PDB file of C-alpha atoms and ligand atoms in Angstrom:
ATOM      1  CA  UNK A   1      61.581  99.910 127.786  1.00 56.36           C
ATOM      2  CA  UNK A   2      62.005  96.417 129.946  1.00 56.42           C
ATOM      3  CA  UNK A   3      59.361  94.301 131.070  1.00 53.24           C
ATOM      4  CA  UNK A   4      59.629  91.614 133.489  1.00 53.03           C
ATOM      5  CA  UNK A   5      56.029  89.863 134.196  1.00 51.47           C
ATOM      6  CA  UNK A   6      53.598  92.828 134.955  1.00 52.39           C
ATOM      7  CA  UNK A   7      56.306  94.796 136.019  1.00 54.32           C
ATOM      8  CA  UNK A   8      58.413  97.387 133.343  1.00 53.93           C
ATOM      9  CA  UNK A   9      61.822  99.225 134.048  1.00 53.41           C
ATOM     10  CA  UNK A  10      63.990 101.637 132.062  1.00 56.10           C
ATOM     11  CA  UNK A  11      68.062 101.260 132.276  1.00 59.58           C
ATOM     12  CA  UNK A  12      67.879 105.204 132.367  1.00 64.58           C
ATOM     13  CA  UNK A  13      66.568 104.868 136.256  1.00 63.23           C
ATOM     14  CA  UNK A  14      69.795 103.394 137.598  1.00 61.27           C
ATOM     15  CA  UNK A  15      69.505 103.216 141.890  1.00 62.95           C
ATOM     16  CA  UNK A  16      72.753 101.603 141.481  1.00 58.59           C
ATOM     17  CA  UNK A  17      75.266  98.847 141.463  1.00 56.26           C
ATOM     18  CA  UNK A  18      77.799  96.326 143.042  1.00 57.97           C
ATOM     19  CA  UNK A  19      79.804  93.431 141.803  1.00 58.72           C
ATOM     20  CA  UNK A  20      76.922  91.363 141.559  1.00 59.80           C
ATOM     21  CA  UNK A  21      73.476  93.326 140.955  1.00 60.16           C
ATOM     22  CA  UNK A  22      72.733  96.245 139.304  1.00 59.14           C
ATOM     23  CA  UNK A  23      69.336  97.645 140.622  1.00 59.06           C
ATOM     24  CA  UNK A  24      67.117 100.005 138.329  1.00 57.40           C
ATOM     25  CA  UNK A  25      63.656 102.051 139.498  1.00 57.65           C
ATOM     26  CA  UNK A  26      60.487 100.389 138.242  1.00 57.55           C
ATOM     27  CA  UNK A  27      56.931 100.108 138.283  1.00 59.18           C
ATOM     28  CA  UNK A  28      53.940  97.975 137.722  1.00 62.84           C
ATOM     29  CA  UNK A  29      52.510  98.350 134.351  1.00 62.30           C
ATOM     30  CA  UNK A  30      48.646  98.237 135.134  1.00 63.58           C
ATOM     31  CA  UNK A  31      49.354  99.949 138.850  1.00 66.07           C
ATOM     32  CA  UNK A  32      51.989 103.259 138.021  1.00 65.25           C
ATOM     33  CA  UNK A  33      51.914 104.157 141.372  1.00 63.90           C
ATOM     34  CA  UNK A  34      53.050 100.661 142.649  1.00 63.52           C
ATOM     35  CA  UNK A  35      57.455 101.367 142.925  1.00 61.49           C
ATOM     36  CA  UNK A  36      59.431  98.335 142.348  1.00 59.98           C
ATOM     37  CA  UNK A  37      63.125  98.094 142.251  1.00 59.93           C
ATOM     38  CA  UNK A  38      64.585  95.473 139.634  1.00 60.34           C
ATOM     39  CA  UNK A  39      68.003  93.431 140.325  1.00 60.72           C
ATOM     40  CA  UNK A  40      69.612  92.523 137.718  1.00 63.98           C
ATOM     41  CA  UNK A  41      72.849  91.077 136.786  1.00 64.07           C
ATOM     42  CA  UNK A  42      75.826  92.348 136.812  1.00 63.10           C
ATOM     43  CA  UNK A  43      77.426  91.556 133.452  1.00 63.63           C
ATOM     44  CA  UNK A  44      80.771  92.229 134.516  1.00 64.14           C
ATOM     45  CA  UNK A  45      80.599  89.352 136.831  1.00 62.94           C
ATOM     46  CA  UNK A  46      78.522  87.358 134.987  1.00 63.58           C
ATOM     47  CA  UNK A  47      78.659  84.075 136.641  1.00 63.24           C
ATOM     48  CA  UNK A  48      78.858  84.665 139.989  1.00 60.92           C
ATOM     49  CA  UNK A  49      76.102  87.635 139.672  1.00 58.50           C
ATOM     50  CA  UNK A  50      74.300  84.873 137.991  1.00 59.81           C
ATOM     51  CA  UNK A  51      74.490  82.431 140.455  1.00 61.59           C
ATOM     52  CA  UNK A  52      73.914  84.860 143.752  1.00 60.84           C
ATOM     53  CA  UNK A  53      70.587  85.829 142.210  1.00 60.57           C
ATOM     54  CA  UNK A  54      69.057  82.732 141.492  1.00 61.19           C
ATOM     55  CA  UNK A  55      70.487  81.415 145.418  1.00 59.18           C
ATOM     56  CA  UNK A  56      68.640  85.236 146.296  1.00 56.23           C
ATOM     57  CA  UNK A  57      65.560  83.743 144.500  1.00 58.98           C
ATOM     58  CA  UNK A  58      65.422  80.773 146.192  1.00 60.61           C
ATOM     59  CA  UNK A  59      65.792  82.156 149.565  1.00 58.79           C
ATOM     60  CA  UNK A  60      63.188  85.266 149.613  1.00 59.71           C
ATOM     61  CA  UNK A  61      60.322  83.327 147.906  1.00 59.04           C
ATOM     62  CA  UNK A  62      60.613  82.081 151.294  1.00 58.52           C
ATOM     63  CA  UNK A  63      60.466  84.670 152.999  1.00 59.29           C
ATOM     64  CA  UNK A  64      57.422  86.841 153.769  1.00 65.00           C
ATOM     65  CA  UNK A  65      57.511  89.482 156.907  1.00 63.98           C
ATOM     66  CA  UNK A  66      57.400  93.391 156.959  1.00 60.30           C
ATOM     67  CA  UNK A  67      60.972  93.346 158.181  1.00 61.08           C
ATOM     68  CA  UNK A  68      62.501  91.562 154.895  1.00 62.73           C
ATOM     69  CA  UNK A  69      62.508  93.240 151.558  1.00 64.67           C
ATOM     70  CA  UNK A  70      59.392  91.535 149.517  1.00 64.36           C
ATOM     71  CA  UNK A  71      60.098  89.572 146.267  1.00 63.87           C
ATOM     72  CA  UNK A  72      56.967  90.899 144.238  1.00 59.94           C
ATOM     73  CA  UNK A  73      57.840  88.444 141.217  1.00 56.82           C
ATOM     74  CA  UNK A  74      61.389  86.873 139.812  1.00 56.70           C
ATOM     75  CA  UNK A  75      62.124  85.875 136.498  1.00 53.55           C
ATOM     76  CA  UNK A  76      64.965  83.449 135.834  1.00 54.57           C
ATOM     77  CA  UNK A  77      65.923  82.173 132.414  1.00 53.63           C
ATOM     78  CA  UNK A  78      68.904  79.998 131.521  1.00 52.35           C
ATOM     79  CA  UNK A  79      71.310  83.657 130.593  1.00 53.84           C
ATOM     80  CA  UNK A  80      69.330  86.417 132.655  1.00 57.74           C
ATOM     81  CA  UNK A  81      68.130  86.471 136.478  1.00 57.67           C
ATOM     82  CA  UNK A  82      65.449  89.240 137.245  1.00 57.35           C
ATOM     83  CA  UNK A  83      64.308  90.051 140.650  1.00 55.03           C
ATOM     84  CA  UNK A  84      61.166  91.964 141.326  1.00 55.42           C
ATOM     85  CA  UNK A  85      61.142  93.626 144.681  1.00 54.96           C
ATOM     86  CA  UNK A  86      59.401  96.349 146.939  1.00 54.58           C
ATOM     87  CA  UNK A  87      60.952  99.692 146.466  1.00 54.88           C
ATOM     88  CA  UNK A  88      62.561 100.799 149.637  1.00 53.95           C
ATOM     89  CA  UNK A  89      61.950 105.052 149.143  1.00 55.25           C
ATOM     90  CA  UNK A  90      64.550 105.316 152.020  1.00 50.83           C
ATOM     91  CA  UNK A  91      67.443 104.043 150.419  1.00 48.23           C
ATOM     92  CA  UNK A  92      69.949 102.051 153.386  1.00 48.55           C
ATOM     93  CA  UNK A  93      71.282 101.953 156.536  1.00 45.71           C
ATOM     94  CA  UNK A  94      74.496 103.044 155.372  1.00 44.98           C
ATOM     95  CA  UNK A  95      73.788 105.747 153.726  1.00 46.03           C
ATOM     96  CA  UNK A  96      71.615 107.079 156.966  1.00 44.06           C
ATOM     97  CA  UNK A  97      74.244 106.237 159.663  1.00 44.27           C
ATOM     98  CA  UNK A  98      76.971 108.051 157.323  1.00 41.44           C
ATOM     99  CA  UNK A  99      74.502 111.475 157.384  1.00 41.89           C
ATOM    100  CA  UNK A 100      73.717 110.593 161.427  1.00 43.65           C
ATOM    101  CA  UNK A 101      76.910 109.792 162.131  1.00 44.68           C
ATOM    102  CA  UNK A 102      75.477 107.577 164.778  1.00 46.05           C
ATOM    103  CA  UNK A 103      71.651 106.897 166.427  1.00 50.06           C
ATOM    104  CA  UNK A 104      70.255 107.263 169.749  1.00 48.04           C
ATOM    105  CA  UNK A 105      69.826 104.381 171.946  1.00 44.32           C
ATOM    106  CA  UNK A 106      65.490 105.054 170.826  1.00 44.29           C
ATOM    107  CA  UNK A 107      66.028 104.779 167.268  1.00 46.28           C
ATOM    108  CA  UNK A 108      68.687 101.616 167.543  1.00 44.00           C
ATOM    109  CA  UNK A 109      65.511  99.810 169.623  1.00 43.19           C
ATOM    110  CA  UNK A 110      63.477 100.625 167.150  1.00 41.79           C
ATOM    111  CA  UNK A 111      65.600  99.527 164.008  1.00 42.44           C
ATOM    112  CA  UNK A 112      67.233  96.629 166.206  1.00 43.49           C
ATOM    113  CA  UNK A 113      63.261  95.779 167.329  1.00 43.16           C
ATOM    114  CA  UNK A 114      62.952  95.270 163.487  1.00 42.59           C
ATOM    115  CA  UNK A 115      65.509  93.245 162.577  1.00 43.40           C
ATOM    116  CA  UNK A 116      64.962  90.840 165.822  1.00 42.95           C
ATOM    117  CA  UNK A 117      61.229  90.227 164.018  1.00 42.60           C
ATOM    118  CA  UNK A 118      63.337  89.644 160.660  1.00 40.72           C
ATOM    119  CA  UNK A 119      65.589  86.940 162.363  1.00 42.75           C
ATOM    120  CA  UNK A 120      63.151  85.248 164.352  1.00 41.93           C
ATOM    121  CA  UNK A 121      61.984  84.330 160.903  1.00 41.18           C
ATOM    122  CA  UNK A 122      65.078  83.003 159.409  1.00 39.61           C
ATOM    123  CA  UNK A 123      65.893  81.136 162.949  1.00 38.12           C
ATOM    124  CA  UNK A 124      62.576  79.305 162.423  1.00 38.57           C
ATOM    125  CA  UNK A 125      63.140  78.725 158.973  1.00 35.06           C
ATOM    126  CA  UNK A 126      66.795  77.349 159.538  1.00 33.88           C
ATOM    127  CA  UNK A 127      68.161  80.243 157.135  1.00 32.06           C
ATOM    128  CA  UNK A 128      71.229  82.014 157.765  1.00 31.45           C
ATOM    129  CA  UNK A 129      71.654  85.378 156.514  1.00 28.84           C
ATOM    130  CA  UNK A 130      75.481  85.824 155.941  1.00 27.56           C
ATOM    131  CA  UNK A 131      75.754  88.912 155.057  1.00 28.78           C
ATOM    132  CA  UNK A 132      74.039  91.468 157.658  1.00 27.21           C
ATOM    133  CA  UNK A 133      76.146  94.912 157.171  1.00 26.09           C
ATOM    134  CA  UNK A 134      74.172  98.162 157.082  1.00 27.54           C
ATOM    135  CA  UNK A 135      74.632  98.327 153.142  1.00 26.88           C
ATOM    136  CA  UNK A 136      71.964  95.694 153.416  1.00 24.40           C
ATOM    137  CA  UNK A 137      69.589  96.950 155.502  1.00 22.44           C
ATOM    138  CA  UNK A 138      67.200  99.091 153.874  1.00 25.94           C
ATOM    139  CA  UNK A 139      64.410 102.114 154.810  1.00 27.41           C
ATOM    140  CA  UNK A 140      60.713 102.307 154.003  1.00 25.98           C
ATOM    141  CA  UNK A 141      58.341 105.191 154.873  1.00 22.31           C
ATOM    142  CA  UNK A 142      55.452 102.856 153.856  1.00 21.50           C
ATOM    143  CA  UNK A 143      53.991 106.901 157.413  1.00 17.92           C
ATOM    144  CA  UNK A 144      56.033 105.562 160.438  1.00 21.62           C
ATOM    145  CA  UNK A 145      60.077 103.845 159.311  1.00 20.58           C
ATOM    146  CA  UNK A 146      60.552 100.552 158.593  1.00 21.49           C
ATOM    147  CA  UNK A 147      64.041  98.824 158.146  1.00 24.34           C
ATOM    148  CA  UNK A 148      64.106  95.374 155.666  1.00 24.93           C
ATOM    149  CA  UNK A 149      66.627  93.536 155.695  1.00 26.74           C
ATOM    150  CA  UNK A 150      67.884  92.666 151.796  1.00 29.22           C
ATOM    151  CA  UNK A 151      70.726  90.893 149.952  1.00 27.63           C
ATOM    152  CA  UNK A 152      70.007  87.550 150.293  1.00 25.14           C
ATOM    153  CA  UNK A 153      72.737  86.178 147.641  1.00 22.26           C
ATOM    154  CA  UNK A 154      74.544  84.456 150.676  1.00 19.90           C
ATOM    155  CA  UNK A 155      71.966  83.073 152.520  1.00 22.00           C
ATOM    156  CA  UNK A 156      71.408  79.359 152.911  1.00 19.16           C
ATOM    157  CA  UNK A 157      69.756  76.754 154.565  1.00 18.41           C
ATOM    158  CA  UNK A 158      71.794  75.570 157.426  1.00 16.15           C
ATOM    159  CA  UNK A 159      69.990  72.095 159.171  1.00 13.82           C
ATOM    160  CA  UNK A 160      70.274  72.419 162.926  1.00 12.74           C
ATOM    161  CA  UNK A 161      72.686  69.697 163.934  1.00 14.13           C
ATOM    162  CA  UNK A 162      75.377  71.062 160.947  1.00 16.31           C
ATOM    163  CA  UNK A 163      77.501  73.985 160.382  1.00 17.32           C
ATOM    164  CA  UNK A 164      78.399  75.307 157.581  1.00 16.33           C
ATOM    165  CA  UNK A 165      81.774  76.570 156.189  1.00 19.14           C
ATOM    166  CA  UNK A 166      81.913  78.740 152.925  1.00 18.30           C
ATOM    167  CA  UNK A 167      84.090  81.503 153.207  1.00 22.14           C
ATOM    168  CA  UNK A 168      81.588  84.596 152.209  1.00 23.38           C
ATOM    169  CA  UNK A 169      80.197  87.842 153.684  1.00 25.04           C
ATOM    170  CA  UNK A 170      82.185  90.927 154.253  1.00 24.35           C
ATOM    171  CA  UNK A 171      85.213  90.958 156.501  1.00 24.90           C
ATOM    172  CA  UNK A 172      84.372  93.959 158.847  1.00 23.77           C
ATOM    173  CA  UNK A 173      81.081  92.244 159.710  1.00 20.66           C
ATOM    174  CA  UNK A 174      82.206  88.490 159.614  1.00 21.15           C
ATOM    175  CA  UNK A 175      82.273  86.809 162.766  1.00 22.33           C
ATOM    176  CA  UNK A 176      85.961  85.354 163.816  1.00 22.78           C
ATOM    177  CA  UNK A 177      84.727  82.050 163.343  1.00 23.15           C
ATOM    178  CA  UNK A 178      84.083  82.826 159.927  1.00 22.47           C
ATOM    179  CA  UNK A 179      86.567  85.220 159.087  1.00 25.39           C
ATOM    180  CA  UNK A 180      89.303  82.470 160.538  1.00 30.18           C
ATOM    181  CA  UNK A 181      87.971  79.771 158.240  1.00 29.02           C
ATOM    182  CA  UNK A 182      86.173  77.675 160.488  1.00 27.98           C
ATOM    183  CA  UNK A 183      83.237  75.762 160.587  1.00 29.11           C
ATOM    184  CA  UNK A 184      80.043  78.392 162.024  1.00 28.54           C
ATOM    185  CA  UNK A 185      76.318  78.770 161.839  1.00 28.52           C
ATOM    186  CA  UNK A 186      73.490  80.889 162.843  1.00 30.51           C
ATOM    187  CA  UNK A 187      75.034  83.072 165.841  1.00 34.65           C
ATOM    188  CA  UNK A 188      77.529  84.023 162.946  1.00 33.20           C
ATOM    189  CA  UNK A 189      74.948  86.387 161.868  1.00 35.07           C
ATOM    190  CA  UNK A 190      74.284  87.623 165.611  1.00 34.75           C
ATOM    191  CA  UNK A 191      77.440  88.618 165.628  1.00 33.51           C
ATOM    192  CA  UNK A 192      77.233  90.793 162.447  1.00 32.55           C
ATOM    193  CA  UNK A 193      73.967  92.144 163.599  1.00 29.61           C
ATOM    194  CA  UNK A 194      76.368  93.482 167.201  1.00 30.73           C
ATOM    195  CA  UNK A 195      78.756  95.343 164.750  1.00 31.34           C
ATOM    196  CA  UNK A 196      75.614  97.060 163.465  1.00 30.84           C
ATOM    197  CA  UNK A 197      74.636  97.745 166.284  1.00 26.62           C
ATOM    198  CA  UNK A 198      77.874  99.015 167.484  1.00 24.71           C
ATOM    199  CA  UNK A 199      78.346 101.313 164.669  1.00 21.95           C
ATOM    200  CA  UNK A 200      75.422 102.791 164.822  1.00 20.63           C
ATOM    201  CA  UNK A 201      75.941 103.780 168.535  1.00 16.70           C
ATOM    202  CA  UNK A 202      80.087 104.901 167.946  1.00 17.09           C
ATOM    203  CA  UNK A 203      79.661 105.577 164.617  1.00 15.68           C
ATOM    204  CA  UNK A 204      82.951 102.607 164.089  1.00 19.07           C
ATOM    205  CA  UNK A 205      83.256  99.047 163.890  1.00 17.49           C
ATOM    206  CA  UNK A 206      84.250  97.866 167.208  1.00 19.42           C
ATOM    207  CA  UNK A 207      87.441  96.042 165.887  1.00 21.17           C
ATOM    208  CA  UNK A 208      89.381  98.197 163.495  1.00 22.27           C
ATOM    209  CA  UNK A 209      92.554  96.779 161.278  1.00 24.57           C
ATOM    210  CA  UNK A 210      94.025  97.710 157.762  1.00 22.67           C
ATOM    211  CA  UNK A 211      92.757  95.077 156.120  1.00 22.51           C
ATOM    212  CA  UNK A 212      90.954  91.680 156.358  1.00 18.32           C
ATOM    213  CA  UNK A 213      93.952  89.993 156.932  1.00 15.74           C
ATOM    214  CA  UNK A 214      94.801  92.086 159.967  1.00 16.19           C
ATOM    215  CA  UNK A 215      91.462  91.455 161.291  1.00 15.60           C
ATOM    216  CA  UNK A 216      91.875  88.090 161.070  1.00 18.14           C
ATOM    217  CA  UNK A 217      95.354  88.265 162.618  1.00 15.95           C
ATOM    218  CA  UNK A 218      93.811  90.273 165.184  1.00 12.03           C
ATOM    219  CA  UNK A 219      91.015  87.997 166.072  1.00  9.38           C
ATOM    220  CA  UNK A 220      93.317  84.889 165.942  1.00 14.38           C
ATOM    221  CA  UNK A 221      95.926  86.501 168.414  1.00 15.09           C
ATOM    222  CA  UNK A 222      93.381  88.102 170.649  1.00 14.09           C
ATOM    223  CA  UNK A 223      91.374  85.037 172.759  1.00 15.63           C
ATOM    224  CA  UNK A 224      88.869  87.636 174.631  1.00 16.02           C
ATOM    225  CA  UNK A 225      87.833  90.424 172.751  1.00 17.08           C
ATOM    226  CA  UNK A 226      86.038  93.424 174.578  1.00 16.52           C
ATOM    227  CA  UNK A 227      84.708  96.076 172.560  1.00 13.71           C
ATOM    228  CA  UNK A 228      84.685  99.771 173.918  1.00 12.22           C
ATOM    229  CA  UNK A 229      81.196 100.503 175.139  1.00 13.41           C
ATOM    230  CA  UNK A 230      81.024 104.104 176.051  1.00 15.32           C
ATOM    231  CA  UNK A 231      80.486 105.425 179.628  1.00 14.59           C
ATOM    232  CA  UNK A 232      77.023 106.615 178.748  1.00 14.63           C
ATOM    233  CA  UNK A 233      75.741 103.694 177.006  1.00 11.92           C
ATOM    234  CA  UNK A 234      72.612 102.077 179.073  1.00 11.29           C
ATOM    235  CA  UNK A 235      73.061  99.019 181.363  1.00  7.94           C
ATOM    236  CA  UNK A 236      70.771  96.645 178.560  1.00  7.35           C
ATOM    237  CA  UNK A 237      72.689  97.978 175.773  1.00  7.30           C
ATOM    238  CA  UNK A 238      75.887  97.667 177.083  1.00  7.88           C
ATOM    239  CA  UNK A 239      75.150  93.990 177.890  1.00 11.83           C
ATOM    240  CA  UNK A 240      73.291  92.925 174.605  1.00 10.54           C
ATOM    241  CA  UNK A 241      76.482  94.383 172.725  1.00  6.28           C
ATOM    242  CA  UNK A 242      79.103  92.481 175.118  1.00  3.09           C
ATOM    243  CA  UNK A 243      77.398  89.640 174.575  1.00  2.00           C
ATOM    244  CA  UNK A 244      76.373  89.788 170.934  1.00  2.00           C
ATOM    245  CA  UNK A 245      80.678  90.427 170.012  1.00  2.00           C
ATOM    246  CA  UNK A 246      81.687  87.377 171.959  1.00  2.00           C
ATOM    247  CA  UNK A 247      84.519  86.360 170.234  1.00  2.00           C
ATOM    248  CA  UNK A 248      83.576  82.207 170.748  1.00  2.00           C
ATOM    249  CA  UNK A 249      80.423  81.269 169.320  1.00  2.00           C
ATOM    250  CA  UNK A 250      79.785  78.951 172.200  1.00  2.00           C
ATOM    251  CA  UNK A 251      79.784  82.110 174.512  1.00  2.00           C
ATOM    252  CA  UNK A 252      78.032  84.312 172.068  1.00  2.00           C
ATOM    253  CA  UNK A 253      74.613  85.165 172.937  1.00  2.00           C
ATOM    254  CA  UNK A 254      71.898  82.728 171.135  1.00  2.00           C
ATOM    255  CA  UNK A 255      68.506  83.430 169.297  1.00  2.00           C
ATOM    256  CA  UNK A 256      66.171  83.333 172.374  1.00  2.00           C
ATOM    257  CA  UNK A 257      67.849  85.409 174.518  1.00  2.00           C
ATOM    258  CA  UNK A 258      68.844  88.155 171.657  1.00  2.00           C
ATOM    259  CA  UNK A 259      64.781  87.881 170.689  1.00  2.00           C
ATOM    260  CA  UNK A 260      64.135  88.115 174.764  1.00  2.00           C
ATOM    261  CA  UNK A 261      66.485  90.645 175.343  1.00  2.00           C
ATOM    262  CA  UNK A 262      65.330  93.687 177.908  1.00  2.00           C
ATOM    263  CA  UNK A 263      67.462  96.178 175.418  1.00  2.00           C
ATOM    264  CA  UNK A 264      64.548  95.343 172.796  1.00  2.00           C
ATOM    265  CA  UNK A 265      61.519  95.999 175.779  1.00  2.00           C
ATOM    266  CA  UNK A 266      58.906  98.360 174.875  1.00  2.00           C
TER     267      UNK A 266
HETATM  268  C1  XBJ B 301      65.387 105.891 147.909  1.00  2.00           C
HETATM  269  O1  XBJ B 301      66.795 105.825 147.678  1.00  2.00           O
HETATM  270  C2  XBJ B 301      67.349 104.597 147.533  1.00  2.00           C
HETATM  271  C3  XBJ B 301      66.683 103.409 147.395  1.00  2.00           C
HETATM  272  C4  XBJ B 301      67.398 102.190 147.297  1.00  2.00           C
HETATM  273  N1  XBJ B 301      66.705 101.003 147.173  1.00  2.00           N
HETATM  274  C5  XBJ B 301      67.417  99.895 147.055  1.00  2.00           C
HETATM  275  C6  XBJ B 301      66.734  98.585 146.984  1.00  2.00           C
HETATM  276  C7  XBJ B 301      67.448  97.400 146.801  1.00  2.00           C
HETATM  277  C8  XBJ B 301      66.763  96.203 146.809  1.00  2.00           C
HETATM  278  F1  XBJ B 301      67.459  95.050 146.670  1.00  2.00           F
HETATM  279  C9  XBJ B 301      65.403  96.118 146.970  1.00  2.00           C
HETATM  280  C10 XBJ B 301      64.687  97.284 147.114  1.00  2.00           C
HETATM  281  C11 XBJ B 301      65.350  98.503 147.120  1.00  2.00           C
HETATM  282  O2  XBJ B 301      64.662  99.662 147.238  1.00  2.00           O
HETATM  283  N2  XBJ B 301      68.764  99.832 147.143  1.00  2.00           N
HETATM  284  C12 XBJ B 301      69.459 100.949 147.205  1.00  2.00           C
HETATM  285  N3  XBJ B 301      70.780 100.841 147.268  1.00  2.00           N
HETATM  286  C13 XBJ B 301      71.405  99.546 147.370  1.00  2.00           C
HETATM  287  C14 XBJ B 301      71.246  98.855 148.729  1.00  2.00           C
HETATM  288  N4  XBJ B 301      72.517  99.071 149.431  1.00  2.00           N
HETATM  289  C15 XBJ B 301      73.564  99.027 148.400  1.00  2.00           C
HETATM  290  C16 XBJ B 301      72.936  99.676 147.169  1.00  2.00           C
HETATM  291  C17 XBJ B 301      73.294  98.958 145.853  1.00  2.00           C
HETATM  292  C18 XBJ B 301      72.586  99.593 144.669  1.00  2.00           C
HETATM  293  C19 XBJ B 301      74.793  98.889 145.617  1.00  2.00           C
HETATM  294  O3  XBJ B 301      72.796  97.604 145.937  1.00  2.00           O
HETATM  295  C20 XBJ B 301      68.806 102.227 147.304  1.00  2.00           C
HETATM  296  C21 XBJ B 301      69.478 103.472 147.404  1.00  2.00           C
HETATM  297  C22 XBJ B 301      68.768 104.640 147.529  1.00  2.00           C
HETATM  298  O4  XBJ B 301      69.291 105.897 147.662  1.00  2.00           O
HETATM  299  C23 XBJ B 301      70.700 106.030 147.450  1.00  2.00           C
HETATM  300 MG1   MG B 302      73.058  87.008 151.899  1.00  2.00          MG
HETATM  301 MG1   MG B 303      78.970  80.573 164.574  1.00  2.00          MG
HETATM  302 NA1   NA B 304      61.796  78.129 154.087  1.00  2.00          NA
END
């Protein structure tokens, strides 16, 4: 039915939605076996979809590495917003941890390996993500599994003497800094990527509340924050998650020794 470039959808093949995309199966129309997935927007939230995919655009035509989900082509007009990207054939993180329940300490290297690659990119490029949650993070079985991370609607440019302040990303993931309205940059995302990684070995977010409001409550009244690391947990782990959910940025680990870390050793 659709075509966007030399790329063609149908509406039928639905992967899914959110507030602000809707994503459908496609394909390329001289190369069938080439699997895209379209973003579209979101109608119901019509300008604010509008304006994440277009700031999505803008970041990922930036962006080539095997670690971020490629933008094959893009099509923006002044009352639609078309993304063109690789089709992930494993679907997300979320949806893997949630059947796992949680990951060895093997396959968190490996995925955490990944994403380091991914965010030595946007370090060099002076992007921050924003929004690094496991909904985000996809699977591809090019044979051997690669994770991408996705969702760029957040992202900016952030220049390296300045911080930046808008209120966005998702509360469970947000560092305090953001999450108590203050002024952050790029280790904001190192925390997020420590929650990950945290979940994915307890199979929880290492600071539970009701809400987002009780987080932040939580994170304002608490001045140290120490996570539960179980007893098992290796020596390098243990330390690259203590140090990743530091709860002042100033403390928090930083891009070189995250990208240096022994945990990620081979
Ligand atoms: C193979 O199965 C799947 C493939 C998927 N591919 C993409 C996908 C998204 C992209 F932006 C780019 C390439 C992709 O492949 N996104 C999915 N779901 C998205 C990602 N997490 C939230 C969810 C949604 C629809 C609310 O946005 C997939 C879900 C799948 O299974 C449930
Ligand atoms: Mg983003
Ligand atoms: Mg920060
Ligand atoms: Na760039």
């Amino acid at each position: 039915t659709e075509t966007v470039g030399k790329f063609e959808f149908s509406r039928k093949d639905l992967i899914g939605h959110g507030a602000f995309a809707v994503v459908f199966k496609g394909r390329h129309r001289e190369k069938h076996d080439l699997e895209v997935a379209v973003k579209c927007i979101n109608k119901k939230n019509l300008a604010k979809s509008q304006t994440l995919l277009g700031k999505e655009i803008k970041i990922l035509k930036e962006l080539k590495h095997e670690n971020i989900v490629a933008l094959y082509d893009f099509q923006e007009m002044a009352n639609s917003v078309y993304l063109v990207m690789e089709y992930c054939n494993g679907g997300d993180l979320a949806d893997y941890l949630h059947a796992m329940r949680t990951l060895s300490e093997d396959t968190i290297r490996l995925f955490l390996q990944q994403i380091a690659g991914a965010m030595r990119l946007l370090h060099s490029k002076g992007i921050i993500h924003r929004d690094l949650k496991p909904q985000n993070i996809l699977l591809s079985n090019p044979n051997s599994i690669r994770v991408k991370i996705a969702d760029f609607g957040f992202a900016r440019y952030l220049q390296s003497n300045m911080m930046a302040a808008t209120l966005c990303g998702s509360p469970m993931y947000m560092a305090p800094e953001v999450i108590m309205s203050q002024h952050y940059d790029g280790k904001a995302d190192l925390w997020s990527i420590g929650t990950i990684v945290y979940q994915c070995l307890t199979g929880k977010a290492p600071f539970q509340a009701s809400s987002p409001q009780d987080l932040r409550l939580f994170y304002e009244k608490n001045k140290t924050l120490v996570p539960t690391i179980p007893r098992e947990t290796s020596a390098p782990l243990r330390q690259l998650l203590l140090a990743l959910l530091q709860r002042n940025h100033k403390d928090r680990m930083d891009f070189d020794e995250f990208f240096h870390h022994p945990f990620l050793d081979a």
